[PDB]
One Martini backbone bead per residue (centre of mass of N, CA, C, O) as a GRO file, in nm:
protein
  114
    1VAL     BB    1  -2.287   0.833  -0.856
    2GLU     BB    2  -2.020   0.713  -0.916
    3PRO     BB    3  -1.775   0.706  -1.127
    4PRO     BB    4  -1.622   0.582  -1.374
    5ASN     BB    5  -1.334   0.441  -1.405
    6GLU     BB    6  -1.308   0.314  -1.093
    7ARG     BB    7  -1.038   0.239  -0.958
    8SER     BB    8  -0.766   0.067  -0.783
    9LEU     BB    9  -0.553  -0.033  -0.495
   10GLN     BB   10  -0.344  -0.306  -0.434
   11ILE     BB   11  -0.216  -0.484  -0.127
   12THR     BB   12   0.020  -0.708  -0.024
   13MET     BB   13   0.087  -0.936   0.259
   14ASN     BB   14   0.403  -1.076   0.422
   15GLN     BB   15   0.499  -1.245   0.702
   16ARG     BB   16   0.803  -1.323   0.859
   17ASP     BB   17   1.109  -1.372   0.975
   18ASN     BB   18   1.168  -1.087   1.061
   19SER     BB   19   0.939  -0.982   0.839
   20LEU     BB   20   0.807  -0.779   0.554
   21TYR     BB   21   0.568  -0.795   0.283
   22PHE     BB   22   0.490  -0.573  -0.012
   23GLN     BB   23   0.244  -0.578  -0.255
   24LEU     BB   24   0.170  -0.452  -0.581
   25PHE     BB   25  -0.140  -0.358  -0.801
   26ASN     BB   26  -0.186  -0.176  -1.053
   27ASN     BB   27  -0.539  -0.117  -1.120
   28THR     BB   28  -0.525   0.109  -1.275
   29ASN     BB   29  -0.579   0.352  -1.569
   30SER     BB   30  -0.293   0.497  -1.556
   31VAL     BB   31  -0.056   0.541  -1.304
   32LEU     BB   32   0.246   0.519  -1.137
   33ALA     BB   33   0.456   0.659  -0.901
   34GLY     BB   34   0.746   0.768  -0.770
   35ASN     BB   35   0.904   0.859  -0.484
   36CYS     BB   36   0.766   0.690  -0.283
   37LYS     BB   37   0.581   0.586   0.015
   38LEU     BB   38   0.535   0.381   0.301
   39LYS     BB   39   0.255   0.348   0.566
   40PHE     BB   40   0.262   0.108   0.736
   41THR     BB   41   0.074  -0.122   0.969
   42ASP     BB   42   0.006  -0.352   1.164
   43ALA     BB   43  -0.281  -0.208   1.254
   44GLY     BB   44  -0.340   0.080   1.481
   45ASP     BB   45  -0.333   0.074   1.783
   46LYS     BB   46  -0.015  -0.076   1.823
   47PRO     BB   47   0.207  -0.010   1.635
   48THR     BB   48   0.471   0.091   1.434
   49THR     BB   49   0.759   0.234   1.249
   50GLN     BB   50   0.670   0.128   0.982
   51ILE     BB   51   0.890   0.229   0.707
   52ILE     BB   52   0.875   0.262   0.365
   53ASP     BB   53   1.016   0.265   0.034
   54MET     BB   54   0.957   0.337  -0.323
   55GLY     BB   55   1.137   0.499  -0.447
   56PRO     BB   56   1.210   0.637  -0.767
   57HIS     BB   57   1.047   0.425  -0.861
   58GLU     BB   58   0.789   0.333  -1.068
   59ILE     BB   59   0.448   0.261  -1.165
   60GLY     BB   60   0.232   0.097  -1.355
   61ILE     BB   61   0.010  -0.077  -1.522
   62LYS     BB   62  -0.058  -0.374  -1.406
   63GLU     BB   63   0.151  -0.401  -1.217
   64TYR     BB   64   0.446  -0.473  -0.990
   65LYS     BB   65   0.548  -0.505  -0.640
   66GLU     BB   66   0.831  -0.570  -0.392
   67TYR     BB   67   0.845  -0.510  -0.045
   68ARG     BB   68   1.113  -0.519   0.199
   69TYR     BB   69   1.132  -0.557   0.552
   70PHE     BB   70   1.318  -0.455   0.862
   71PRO     BB   71   1.234  -0.561   1.116
   72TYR     BB   72   0.955  -0.829   1.161
   73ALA     BB   73   0.780  -1.034   1.414
   74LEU     BB   74   0.516  -0.984   1.412
   75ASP     BB   75   0.134  -0.975   1.392
   76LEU     BB   76  -0.071  -0.955   1.187
   77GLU     BB   77  -0.381  -0.764   1.146
   78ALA     BB   78  -0.695  -0.638   1.166
   79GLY     BB   79  -0.595  -0.304   1.016
   80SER     BB   80  -0.361  -0.281   0.852
   81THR     BB   81  -0.247   0.012   0.754
   82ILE     BB   82  -0.202   0.206   0.453
   83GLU     BB   83   0.044   0.430   0.271
   84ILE     BB   84   0.092   0.642  -0.026
   85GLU     BB   85   0.364   0.865  -0.043
   86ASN     BB   86   0.448   1.050  -0.245
   87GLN     BB   87   0.675   1.287  -0.317
   88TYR     BB   88   0.511   1.499  -0.170
   89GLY     BB   89   0.376   1.345   0.119
   90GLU     BB   90   0.088   1.243   0.021
   91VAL     BB   91  -0.132   1.036   0.049
   92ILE     BB   92  -0.323   0.830  -0.195
   93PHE     BB   93  -0.317   0.539  -0.059
   94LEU     BB   94  -0.544   0.318   0.130
   95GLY     BB   95  -0.528   0.023   0.361
   96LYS     BB   96  -0.646  -0.268   0.500
   97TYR     BB   97  -0.630  -0.559   0.696
   98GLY     BB   98  -0.697  -0.924   0.685
   99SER     BB   99  -0.743  -1.218   0.573
  100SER     BB  100  -0.627  -1.098   0.338
  101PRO     BB  101  -0.338  -0.957   0.198
  102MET     BB  102  -0.524  -0.832  -0.015
  103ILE     BB  103  -0.620  -0.478  -0.031
  104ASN     BB  104  -0.767  -0.230  -0.090
  105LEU     BB  105  -0.744   0.123  -0.113
  106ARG     BB  106  -0.747   0.421  -0.181
  107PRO     BB  107  -0.842   0.734  -0.123
  108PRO     BB  108  -0.898   0.941   0.168
  109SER     BB  109  -0.988   1.131  -0.073
  110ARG     BB  110  -1.192   1.277  -0.257
  111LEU     BB  111  -1.228   1.363  -0.596
  112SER     BB  112  -1.523   1.287  -0.731
  113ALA     BB  113  -1.882   1.408  -0.741
  114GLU     BB  114  -2.221   1.444  -0.850
   0.00000   0.00000   0.00000
């Protein structure tokens, strides 16, 4: 069974008039790093080149951030996948969108498992 103290990362989305907002909620028990970038996508089938930057600023635990991009008058759909590419350039957390704006993320690659 998966290891304990196994937290995750949630990210909320909110599309407005030719614009899209993405909120983060470091639910981890460690801490978030900066100089990261976001690799959000409308849905996944035929998304856009929507690419946001996390800036050099980092995020802490139980923290929170709000990134706004544009233009973007699209229509979010169930599938909107996201990816947080740290300074390294390799996504660490990813998650899709659905009914709710906020959806768990988690790494696309396993970390450890007994």
